[PDB]
Structure 1
Amino acid sequence: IDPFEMAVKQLERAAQYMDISEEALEWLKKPMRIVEVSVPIEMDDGSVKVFTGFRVQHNWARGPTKGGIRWHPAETLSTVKALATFMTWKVAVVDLPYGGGKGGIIVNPKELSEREQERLARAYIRAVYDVIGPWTDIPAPDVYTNPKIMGWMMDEYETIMRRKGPAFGVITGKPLSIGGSLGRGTATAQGAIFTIREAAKALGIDLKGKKIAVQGYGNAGYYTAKLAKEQLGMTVVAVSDSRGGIYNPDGLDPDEVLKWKREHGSVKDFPGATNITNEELLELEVDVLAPAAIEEVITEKNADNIKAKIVAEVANGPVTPEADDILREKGILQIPDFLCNAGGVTVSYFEWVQNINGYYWTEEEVREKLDKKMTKAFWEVYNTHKDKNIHMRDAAYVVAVSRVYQAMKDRGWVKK
């Protein structure tokens, strides 16, 4: 059903466990500003083709909006609005001076060439310039969008702004050569590792030598497994993909698996492991489950088959609302998605701070700062969950919407 309707219904259901006025809830139920523009480019055949681009600024009570740009052929305004609403909560839960935003272009980047991609990025910036800025709206990379497009977009924005302010801060996730940050590439997996470490500390289970399964061997999933094996002392026994999955009782080395992904199709047919499917990995005996794949994979059909003490939501929406209650009844600690993968937006915030200050940090400073914010965020959510006897998703929503509501009351946007 409609993504924005799902997000609004989730917020309504989470509003039951916290004191919020009706006017503020109605304010939060709709985005503050929605921009739909035409994005024309010159194709390699010389013809001009016009694309539809979106930019949604859900709420800027706590600061400038922040969200990625999507280049997907199945992108709609409703999906962008839903993701912007989720970005608002994501930046509110980790205490960032940001609001929630999102953008997108209905396009297939595979069919476009390199020059067409650069033209598309520059035209999107020229179209949405009036509503974006370093203190207004900071975009970021997302699906089918990379630091190269970030660099093109930053260059176009700087060309339009005539270098009259900090142009590097208009967009994050850009190359290190031009205003990039250290630790951006592994930000979300590092944040997820921090939240998993805190969840284990809060459960009383020692994670060294414990089984972990990660679904989806993408950028987030591979690094989640690699850091789980490296700094958490986990044991990656199973990983999965879009074609299938592999499983090994002794465990797998993330470097080899990623090496294999480069020579053969996906992760299927690992030499020493067993070829399994995605549902099999979901209902597999591991200590921590990390579904970093597409959304809606843990559902009512397989909710009661889950046997993982910790379900880390690296992806956006990997667990359905009824699966949340089923897992809570089963006594499984569930880390909400907009809290678990908040490391990416936190490191993007660090990059923005470095851009606006003109001074840049090292790897260690970024890592320690990210560790502190994710630890504080997880502890706030878990304390809210314990003091009120609610699902962890409800506690995270309470924590985020409380900050947003407080900012709205301070600004005088809403009174009661």
Structure 2
Amino acid sequence: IDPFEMAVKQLERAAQYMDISEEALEWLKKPMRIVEVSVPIEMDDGSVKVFTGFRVQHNWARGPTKGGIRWHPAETLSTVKALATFMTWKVAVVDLPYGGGKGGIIVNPKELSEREQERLARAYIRAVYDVIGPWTDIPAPDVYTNPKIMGWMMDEYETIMRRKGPAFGVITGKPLSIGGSLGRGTATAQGAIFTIREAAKALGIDLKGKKIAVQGYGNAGYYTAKLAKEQLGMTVVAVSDSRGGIYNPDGLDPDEVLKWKREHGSVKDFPGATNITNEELLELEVDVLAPAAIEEVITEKNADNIKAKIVAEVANGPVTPEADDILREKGILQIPDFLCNAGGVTVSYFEWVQNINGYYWTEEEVREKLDKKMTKAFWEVYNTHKDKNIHMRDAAYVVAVSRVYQAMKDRGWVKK
């Protein structure tokens, strides 16, 4: 069904546990500004192709909107709106002076060359210039966008802006040479590790030697497993990808599995590990389960089979609303997705702060600040969950929507 409708339904279902006026709810149920533009580029054959670009700013009560740009053939304005709405709550829950934004281009980037990709990024910046800026809207990498495209976009924005202000802060996730930030590549996994470590403290479980199963082995999942092994002292016993999964009760080495995957395409048939499927990985007896591949992997048809103490929603929306109640019934602590993977946007905020301040931090300072922020956010959400006797997802919504609502009231946008 429609992604924006599902996001609105999640907001409405959460709103029953908080005291928010109906006018504020109606304000929050629709994006404040939506921009749809034509993005023309000159192809390598000389023809001019026009692409459809999107730029959604859901709410900027707490500050400039924040959100990445995704390049995808199945990209829809409804998906952009839903993701911007979720970005609002994600920045609100970790207490950032940000609002929620999202961008997208309907394009198959695999059919474009390097020059065509650079032209597409520059044309997108030239088209959405009037609604973005260091204090207006800060994009970032997302699906099929990378630091290289971010650098191209930053250069185009600086050329248009005539270097009048800090042009580095218009976009995050850029290379370290042009105002990048240390700790960006492991941001999401590091934040997820911090939240898992705090959840173990909440449940009174010592993680030094426990089992973790990670679904997905991209930038997020592989680093989640690596940091869980080295920082949390855990034993990775199962990793998977779009092809299949592997299992090893003794433990798996994330670096070796990554090297094997880079060579044979997938992680399957890893030396000394049972082969499994993606569905069997979720139902494996582990202490922490971290789905980080796609959305809606845990539904009402397989939630009774989850036997992990902690479910770390590293991916976006990997658990259906109907499965939340089933998981909570069995006694499983779940870390909501827009809280578990907020480390990426937190480090993006740190990069933006460094850009607008003209002063850049070291790796240790970035990691320490991220640890403080993630620990505080998790404990706020968990205390709200415990006091109000509601689901962790509902508690995170209560925390984020309350902040956005208070900002809206203080601005005078809503009088009630």
Q: Shorter chain as normaliser: what TM range? A: over 0.9
Separation of aligned partners in 2, 1:276 and 1:222: 17
* Deviation string, structure 1 residues 261-302 (Cα, Å, up to 9, x no partner): 111021111111011000100000000000001100000110
In structure 2, the residue corresponding to 1:101 is in which secondary structure?
strand
Separation of aligned partners in 1, 2:324 and 2:293: 18
1:409 CA displacement: 0.1
Alignment partner, residue 367 of structure 1: 367
In structure 1, the residue corresponding to 2:111 is in which secondary structure?
coil
Separation of aligned partners in 2, 1:274 and 1:106: 40
Separation of aligned partners in 2, 1:137 and 1:287: 39
In structure 2, the residue corresponding to 1:242 is in which secondary structure?
coil
In structure 2, the residue corresponding to 1:367 is in which secondary structure?
helix
* Deviation string, structure 1 residues 155-207 (Cα, Å, up to 9, x no partner): 00000000000000000000000000000000000000000000000000100
Separation of aligned partners in 1, 2:55 and 2:324: 31
* Deviation string, structure 1 residues 27-70 (Cα, Å, up to 9, x no partner): 00000000000000000110000000000000000000000000
How do 1:224-303 residues align onto structure 2 when only pairs under 5 Å count? 224-303=224-303
Separation of aligned partners in 2, 1:263 and 1:139: 33
Separation of aligned partners in 1, 2:361 and 2:58: 30
Alignment pair present for 1:322 and 2:322? yes
Separation of aligned partners in 1, 2:260 and 2:170: 38
* Deviation string, structure 1 residues 192-242 (Cα, Å, up to 9, x no partner): 000000000000010011000000001000000000000000100000100
In structure 2, the residue corresponding to 1:50 is in which secondary structure?
strand
Separation of aligned partners in 2, 1:320 and 1:98: 27
Separation of aligned partners in 1, 2:386 and 2:294: 30
* Deviation string, structure 1 residues 3-35 (Cα, Å, up to 9, x no partner): 000000000000000000000000000000000
* Deviation string, structure 1 residues 60-117 (Cα, Å, up to 9, x no partner): 0000000000000010000000000000000000000000000000000100000000
* Deviation string, structure 1 residues 345-388 (Cα, Å, up to 9, x no partner): 00000000000000000000000000000000000000000000
Separation of aligned partners in 2, 1:73 and 1:60: 28
Separation of aligned partners in 2, 1:356 and 1:139: 15
Separation of aligned partners in 2, 1:205 and 1:239: 22
Separation of aligned partners in 2, 1:47 and 1:274: 51
In structure 1, the residue corresponding to 2:280 is in which secondary structure?
helix
Alignment partner, residue 213 of structure 2: 213
In structure 2, the residue corresponding to 1:5 is in which secondary structure?
helix
Separation of aligned partners in 2, 1:284 and 1:170: 44
Separation of aligned partners in 1, 2:61 and 2:263: 48
How do 1:160-239 residues align onto structure 2 when only pairs under 5 Å count? 160-239=160-239
In structure 1, the residue corresponding to 2:212 is in which secondary structure?
strand
Separation of aligned partners in 2, 1:392 and 1:33: 30
**Unpaired stretches in structure 2, ≥5 consecutive residues:** none
* Deviation string, structure 1 residues 127-167 (Cα, Å, up to 9, x no partner): 00000000000000001000000000000000000000000
Separation of aligned partners in 2, 1:247 and 1:109: 34
Alignment pair present for 1:59 and 2:62? no
Separation of aligned partners in 2, 1:206 and 1:17: 32
Give the length in aligned residue pairs. Answer: 416
Return structure 1 stretches of 4+ with deviation > 2 angstroms: none
Separation of aligned partners in 2, 1:4 and 1:315: 18
In structure 2, the residue corresponding to 1:383 is in which secondary structure?
helix
Separation of aligned partners in 2, 1:381 and 1:70: 29
Separation of aligned partners in 1, 2:342 and 2:5: 23
Alignment partner, residue 354 of structure 2: 354
Separation of aligned partners in 2, 1:55 and 1:279: 35
Alignment partner, residue 105 of structure 1: 105
In structure 1, the residue corresponding to 2:284 is in which secondary structure?
coil
How do 1:72-151 residues align onto structure 2 when only pairs under 5 Å count? 72-151=72-151
Alignment partner, residue 341 of structure 1: 341
Separation of aligned partners in 2, 1:40 and 1:346: 33
In structure 2, the residue corresponding to 1:110 is in which secondary structure?
helix
Separation of aligned partners in 2, 1:237 and 1:275: 12
In structure 1, the residue corresponding to 2:67 is in which secondary structure?
strand
Separation of aligned partners in 2, 1:19 and 1:193: 32
Separation of aligned partners in 1, 2:265 and 2:406: 50
Separation of aligned partners in 2, 1:166 and 1:370: 24
In structure 1, the residue corresponding to 2:414 is in which secondary structure?
coil
Separation of aligned partners in 1, 2:368 and 2:39: 40
In structure 1, the residue corresponding to 2:110 is in which secondary structure?
coil
Separation of aligned partners in 1, 2:323 and 2:207: 25
In structure 1, the residue corresponding to 2:214 is in which secondary structure?
strand
**What CA RMSD, in Å, does the superposition of the two structures yield over aligned residues?**
0.3
In structure 2, the residue corresponding to 1:297 is in which secondary structure?
coil
